[PDB]
Amino acid sequence: LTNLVAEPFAKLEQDFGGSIGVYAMDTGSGATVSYRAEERFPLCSSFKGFLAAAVLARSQQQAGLLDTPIRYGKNALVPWSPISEKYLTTGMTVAELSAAAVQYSDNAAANLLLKELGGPAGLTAFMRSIGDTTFRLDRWQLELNSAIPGDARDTSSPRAVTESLQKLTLGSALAAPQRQQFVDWLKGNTTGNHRIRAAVPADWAVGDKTGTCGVYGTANDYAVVWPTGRAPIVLAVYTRAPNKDDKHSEAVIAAAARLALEGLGVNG
Ligand SMILES: *C(=O)[C@H]([C@@H](C)O)[C@H]1C[C@@H](SCC/N=C\N)C(C(=O)O)=N1
Numbered sequence: 001l002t003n004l005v006a007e008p009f010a011k012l013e014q015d016f017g018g019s020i021g022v023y024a025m026d027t028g029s030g031a032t033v034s035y036r037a038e039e040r041f042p043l044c045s046s047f048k049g050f051l052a053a054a055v056l057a058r059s060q061q062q063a064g065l066l067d068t069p070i071r072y073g074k075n076a077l078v079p080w081s082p083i084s085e086k087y088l089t090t091g092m093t094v095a096e097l098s099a100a101a102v103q104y105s106d107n108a109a110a111n112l113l114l115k116e117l118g119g120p121a122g123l124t125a126f127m128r129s130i131g132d133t134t135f136r137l138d139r140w141q142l143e144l145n146s147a148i149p150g151d152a153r154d155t156s157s158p159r160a161v162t163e164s165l166q167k168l169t170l171g172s173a174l175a176a177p178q179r180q181q182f183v184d185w186l187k188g189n190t191t192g193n194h195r196i197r198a199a200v201p202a203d204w205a206v207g208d209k210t211g212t213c214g215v216y217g218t219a220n221d222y223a224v225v226w227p228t229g230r231a232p233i234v235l236a237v238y239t240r241a242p243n244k245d246d247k248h249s250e251a252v253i254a255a256a257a258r259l260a261l262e263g264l265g266v267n268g
Contacts, residue, residue: 001031007259009035016252018217018241023158024260027170028231033263040134040155041238042147042218044211045105047123047137047154049222051113052098052185053168054126056178058117059094066095070112078141081108102185102209111141120144120154127164130173134160147218149242161222161236169207169224170232183207186224194250195221196237199257201268204228212248217241219248221257227266235260 013020023037059065071091077084083100084092085108092100097113100106117123120137127135137144138153145154167173169183186207200206200223208223222236237256239248261268 001029002034003263004031005263005265007033007035007263009256009259012252012255012259013239016217016239016241016249017246018239020252020256021158021238022236022256022260023162024233024235024264025162025166026231026233026264026266027166031264033235033260034159037159038157040152040157041220041240042145042211042213042216043135043137043154043156044145044147044213044218044220045107045110046161046209046211046220046222047144048101048105048110049186049209050127050135050164050168051110051117051123052102053174053182054117054123055094055098055113056174056182057126057129060175060178066093066098068094070094070097072108072112076108076112078107078111081106084108084112099185099188103188103190105191105210107141114140130164130167132156132160132164135164145213145215147213147216147240149216149240158236158238161238162234165222165224165236166234170234183224192221192223195253196223196225196235196257198250198254199261199268200225201227215244217243217246217248219250219253221253223257227268230266233261233264233266 021036024033097109100109135156192208205226211220218240220238225233
């Protein structure tokens with residue numbers, strides 16, 4: 001049931017000037033679309049969605065965790081912290097930091113939560129605990145986005161991203177209340193309107209998390225999509241390019257998502 005219908009991914013990545021990796025799953029029939037799906041690509045900020053899921057998992061054993069108030073100093077505010085900078089003088093709860101990390105890609109919020117979990121190795125350990133043997137987070141923020149060609153640090157594959165996303169949003173990796181909270185945070189994302197969402201009709205529900213490293217044409221998005229009248233679709237779209245100053249493209253990500261839905265026979 002893999003690639004029952006071929007799609008012109010190769011022409012798309014050649015026009016872009018780099019590499020595109022796609023893995024999309026129809027959770028009803030099990031049919032898939034797969035292109036460079038087992039290659040490694042930089043996660044960039046997309047790790048923050050899995051970070052929030054790891055916080056929710058811990059909250060199953062710590063009933064007070066989500067409402068715990070976290071204060072922080074000005075030294076915590078790194079570039080692109082649009083929510084946490086408004087609460088510097090007050091603090092924010094763990095749940096609020098998680099929402100900001102998912103929905104605004106807030107960097108200070110993600111760093112505080114990574115600390116709570118035991119750093120890059122702690123997030124990696126959570127991913128191992130749901131059966132993902134590909135994901136690796138290795139560095140703390142900023143340098144984790146270097147996107148160096150051939151460097152496996154801070155990478156995963158489109159396939160492992162999609163499989164883990166399915167387990168957390170639709171499967172049994174989280175308890176039911178935590179599962180729906182993760183879905184609700186993804187549905188509220190504000191940074192993805194020109195990526196997978198641009199390929200999804202307005203009357204379908206959708207949640208996603210983006211990544212944009214800023215170098216090497218490297219950017220990405222993953223999403224769960226609920227077309228009406230059929231089972232949900234889970235997909236991941238990752239890009240990279242050979243030269244440090246190659247630009248990323250949101251349009252290429254949206255176009256790749258459209259080809260994935262077409263390959264699955266989902267009318268959009
Ligand atoms: C994560 O990928 C980004 C980290 C490295 O800052 C973060 C920033 C935004 S896009 C770039 C912001 N504007 C000028 N540089 C982002 C996202 O929306 O995915 N995540």
